[PDB]
């Protein structure tokens, strides 16, 4: 039905109950309420409607003062239809933010309070303050600085010196000035020239900036016109640029829309623990339960893994055993990690669950007393380890129904004990430096460090002073040879780390991996990542986000670093937000990711408004896709398409989907839905195809896909993008189309629509013989590129095919076929739907693949055109060579993605795939002669595939 019965609670105590329309805005409901209240008792005691604000309990179980009364009750979406009138005033700014954060981040802010955890309370206190400061500090500074934050420049990785005309206009005025300008002109030159056209006095050029009208992409700074993506895109296509001059004041109008709110080693007895009781264990009664425990630091064991006795299976098994480990209390490193696994065993091996605990807390204190560890279920995999030390440290959120081992860390001393401070570490670490002047071991270490085994480790440890001196890049090699189960060694290695020279970004990425848990290591890594430019940081933001999953404590350097950068650059904030938001459904990260999103939001109230509009658009798309999914099972597609529109016509649906910045690119503007062009694709999950339009620009499209997982397709597209940058940085544009792919939620996301494209299978389907049928792709490019433009179109195809051939080989992406490879009208081959990679699907190496159909187009229809075909061979060879030069970057990045828990990227073999495909074990000459053999054999195979095709 349309109308809802709503409960109204008046501040006189009076209660009033009557139906109102779901679509009615809160201001309309308040009118209806006042009209009805007249005829109920104590009306004359009430103040005016404006004196009060509705309150309600929202979907996240929190009271919300509903300040914006231009909102429909169906969009407010209270838990029960119950509205309470309360006094308006009482710092309404902080109240309103706290409410919007809860709905935006998914989790309710009260769920942090409920935990009664100091670590959470200190994080929130420290980080929310830090973010509130930066945002306040941002609002103070100039419009240029603010423009840089809000709309950072989109440059190419960067010769032509050409001349081409450009349309320019001013804000408000309809008429436009087209005038000539060369490629290598700084933006001021265009602005000053555009002001002469205005005059031929009034204004000056340095109180202005050029907006690429249609979108939020601004043109400024010392860089020339040719390095901007828009102009570069306009020059390559041939189309004329279209800009708008905008005043400094008009930019301060955006800045001041809304304001941010105002402001010991004396304990030599062995480590031991009391295992008390299990709870809520589900297992087979014939078996008997065991609990295996072990201390860890990173991936390596600190000591032998002692176990329990076999107690009988039940819900509430009781051990009451002291477990003593072969390591002292004084030896434990800062990130020592006690790790449990409850097993079910035949008496005479089933892993039930597991749980890890940090022996020291977030305040550097050694934890004592009882702990109720709520456990995570064990999932079986190829390498079935006893314990799972790489697993998370925060407990299972499901305390209602989950299992739990009850244990008790004993009191070691009367007063509490901490891990020593950095001063006492450098005290012990500095001393015991010895054994200089050793010539024989300089050859031995160099031999070792130009490629670990136990013989080799002790040599590296002895010559640690010389490693710092001569082999600085081999820090990670040294960190692993360090024996973390002895506190003497740990002091000596940390002493060197404080003095260790700043490593390059590449080296510092390796140091973020799970093998290097120490706080001093991660701190050193970030210190080296702090020189990343925003462009380069963006290229790795996915990987840095995943690495948070194996951080020990909430407040860490990496988090502070990410928030630092997000507050300085709004685009980095945007993508940090969705990377976190799309994993808030995952119990193991919900708290960590929850608290960070709160911090970001408090320092990004501007963008917080934009992300709300996006969240609600995505909210409606789920509802729309779910109706389509259900309708497809019932009726035919044609009628479902018309029925989809009828839902899209509605007040709530049309306005929510209309007028919002794209999640895939917040500079891109989605304005008017083209409901005529809206549809859904034929695919298991039936993803929605939403087309937009813009009178300012210009026709953008998106795909809302819900049900399948997009994380792997994002990673793959991130890598093809990264490749494209690396290739562009060596002056090779291979015309790639790394379309945007963004996971927004639980098996939910957006995919960029590449305009003016179709699948190879569909292009070939027009000219069918039914058992020549070839030249279908080539015929198609004639119609979309007539006369002289075909030569360009063939070049776009050759260049693009080369990059996508190498890309798909290197990343190990199989299942490539006609109906998942696409051409553009420009003539650019590009690939879609990278469901599988690194050889997976069964697990064999994906060979290099040339298709005949594509070679035929490359050769311009001729059977033999070796001049043109050699060019293509060179494009492939040059491409592959460049990726090898940055092989370690790919390996390190993929090594961090192991955190993400993707099936196809889960282990060393999956990384080894990249090693072998890039031939990183071989020399550059040897690598490249192997690539030719692959190429040649793909060329021989190309014929044999299409001769079999009927």
């Amino acid at each position: 039905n349309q109308s809802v019965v709503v409960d109204f609670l008046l501040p006189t105590g009076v209660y009033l109950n009557f139906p109102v329309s779901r679509n009615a805005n809160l201001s309309t409901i308040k009118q209806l309420l006042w009209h009805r209240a007249q005829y109920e008792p104590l009306f004359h005691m009430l103040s005016g409607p404006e004196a009060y604000v509705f309150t309600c309990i929202n979907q996240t179980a929190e009271q919300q003062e509903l300040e914006d009364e231009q909102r429909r009750l169906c969009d407010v979406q209270p838990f029960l239809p119950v509205l309470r009138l309360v006094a308006r005033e009482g710092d309404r700014v902080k109240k309103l933010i706290n409410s919007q954060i809860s709905l935006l981040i998914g989790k309710g802010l009260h769920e942090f309070d409920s935990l009664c955890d100091p670590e959470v309370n200190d994080f929130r206190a420290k980080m929310c303050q830090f973010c509130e400061e930066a945002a306040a500090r941002r609002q103070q500074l100039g419009w240029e600085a603010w423009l840089q934050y809000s709309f950072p420049l989109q440059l190419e990785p960067s010769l032509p010196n050409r001349a081409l005309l450009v349309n320019v206009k001013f804000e408000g005025s309809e008429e436009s000035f087209t005038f000539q300008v060369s490629t290598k002109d700084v933006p001021l030159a265009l602005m000053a020239c555009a002001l002469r056209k205005k005059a031929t006095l009034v204004e000056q050029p340095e109180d202005y900036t050029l907006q690429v009208n249609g979108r939020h992409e601004y043109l400024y700074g010392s860089y020339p016109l040719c390095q901007f993506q828009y102009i570069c895109s306009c020059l390559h296509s041939g189309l004329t640029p279209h800009l708008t001059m905008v005043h400094s004041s008009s930019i301060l109008a955006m800045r001041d829309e809304q304001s941010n709110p105002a402001p010991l080693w004396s304990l030599e007895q062995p480590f031991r623990i009391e295992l008390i009781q299990g709870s809520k264990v589900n297992a087979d009664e014939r078996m008997k339960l065991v609990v295996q425990a072990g201390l860890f630091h990173g991936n390596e064991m600190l000591c032998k893994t002692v176990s329990s006795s076999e107690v009988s299976v039940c819900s509430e098994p009781v051990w009451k055993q002291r477990l003593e480990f072969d390591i002292n209390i004084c030896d434990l490193p800062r990130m020592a990690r006690l790790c449990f696994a409850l097993y079910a065993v035949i008496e005479k091996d089933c892993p039930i669950a597991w749980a890890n605990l940090m022996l020291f807390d977030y305040k550097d204190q050694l934890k004592t007393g009882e702990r109720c560890l709520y456990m995570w279920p064990s999932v079986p995999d190829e390498k079935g380890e006893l314990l799972n030390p790489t697993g998370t440290v925060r407990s299972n959120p499901n305390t209602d129904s989950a299992a739990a081992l009850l244990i008790c860390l004993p009191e070691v001393a009367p007063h509490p004990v901490y891990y020593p401070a950095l001063e006492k570490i450098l005290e012990l670490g500095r001393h015991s430096e010895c054994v200089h002047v050793t010539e024989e071991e300089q050859l031995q270490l160099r031999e070792i460090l130009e490629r670990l085994y136990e013989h080799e480790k002790d040599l590296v440890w002895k010559l640690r002073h010389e490693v710092q001196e001569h082999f600085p890049e081999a820090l990670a090699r040294l960190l692993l040879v360090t024996k973390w189960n002895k506190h003497e060694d740990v002091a000596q290695m940390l002493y060197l780390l404080c003095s260790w020279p700043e490593l390059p970004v590449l080296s510092a990425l390796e140091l973020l991996d799970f093998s290097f848990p120490d706080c001093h290591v991660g701190s050193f890594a970030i210190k080296s990542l702090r020189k990343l430019t925003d462009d380069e940081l963006f290229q790795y933001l996915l990987q840095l986000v995943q690495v948070l999953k194996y951080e020990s404590y909430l407040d860490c350097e990496l988090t502070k670093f990410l928030l630092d950068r997000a507050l300085a650059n709004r685009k980095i904030g945007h993508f940090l937000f969705w990377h976190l938001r799309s994993e808030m459904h995952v119990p193991s990260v919900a708290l960590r990711f929850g608290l960070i999103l709160e911090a970001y939001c408090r320092g990004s109230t501007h963008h917080m408004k934009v992300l709300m509009k996006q969240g609600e658009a995505l909210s409606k798309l789920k509802a729309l896709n779910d109706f389509v999914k259900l309708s497809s099972q019932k009726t035919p597609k044609p009628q479902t398409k018309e029925l989809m529109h009828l839902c899209m016509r509605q007040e709530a649906y049309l306005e929510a989907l209309s007028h919002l910045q794209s999640p895939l690119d917040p500079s891109t503007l989605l304005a008017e839905v083209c409901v005529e062009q809206c549809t859904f694709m034929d695919s298991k999950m039936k993803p929605l195809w939403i087309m937009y339009s813009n009178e300012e620009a210009g026709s953008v499209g998106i795909i809302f896909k819900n049900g399948d997982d997009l994380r792997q397709d994002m990673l793959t597209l991130q890598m093809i993008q990264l490749m494209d940058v690396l290739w562009k940085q060596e002056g090779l544009d291979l015309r790639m189309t790394p379309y945007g792919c963004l996971p927004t939620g639980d098996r939910t996301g957006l995919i960029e629509v590449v305009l003016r494209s179709d699948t190879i299978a569909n292009i070939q389907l027009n000219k069918s013989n039914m058992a020549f049928n070839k030249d279908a792709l080539l015929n198609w490019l004639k119609s979309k590129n007539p006369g002289e433009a075909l030569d360009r179109a063939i070049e776009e195809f050759t260049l693009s095919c080369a990059g996508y051939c190498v890309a798909t080989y290197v990343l190990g992406i199989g299942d490539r076929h006609s109906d998942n490879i696409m051409i553009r009208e420009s003539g650019q081959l590009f690939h879609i739907d990278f469901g599988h990679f690194l050889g997976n699907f069964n697990r064999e190496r994906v060979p290099f693949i040339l298709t005949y159909d594509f070679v035929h187009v490359i050769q311009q229809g001729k059977t033999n055109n070796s001049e043109k075909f050699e060019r293509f061979r060179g494009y492939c060879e040059r491409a592959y060579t460049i990726l090898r030069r940055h092989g370690l970057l790919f390996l390190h990045l993929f090594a961090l993605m192991r955190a993400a828990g993707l099936p196809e990227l889960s282990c060393s073999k999956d990384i080894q795939y990249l090693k072998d495909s890039l031939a990183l074990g071989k020399t550059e000459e040897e690598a490249l002669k192997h690539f030719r053999v692959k190429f040649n054999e793909a060329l021989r195979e190309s014929w044999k595939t299409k001769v079999n095709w009927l």
Binding site: G13, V14, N17, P41, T60, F79, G384, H585
Partner: protein
Amino acid sequence: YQQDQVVKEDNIEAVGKKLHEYNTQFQEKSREYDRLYEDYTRTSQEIQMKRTAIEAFNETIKIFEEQCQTQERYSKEYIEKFKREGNETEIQRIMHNYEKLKSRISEIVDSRRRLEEDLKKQAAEYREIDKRMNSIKPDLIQLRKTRDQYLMWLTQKGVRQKKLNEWLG
């Protein structure tokens, strides 16, 4: 010298036939566990939804209980001044309005209680899933290790990769 081999030595065809069988059984049990692990995760989401829906009922009820506090505290003034000065008719309206509020609370408590009963039943499901999952694990593991021992036996025996892939498919 001796080593504990699970595979009894017949011949390449006999051993390869059992590799196909043990692999087919492994993939089928892997499907079974994965089917349950969805129901595990889905139920874990559904229980957590239910657990916060209970919290929202608590908070809504709280709001109703605050209204009752106000009404009783507020009515005190406009019942003495209404009892004298004639207006017992407004007293009757005031109080009947209050009785209509109290009556609404009972309904909200009733609906809270129904969800508590659902969460109790869905906690029973969750536990049973996990119990079923933990009974299937030892089979899934021993079928993995069996399958792998037969692969390694044939590789050692020198069987070509083409032949192994016929069986593993």
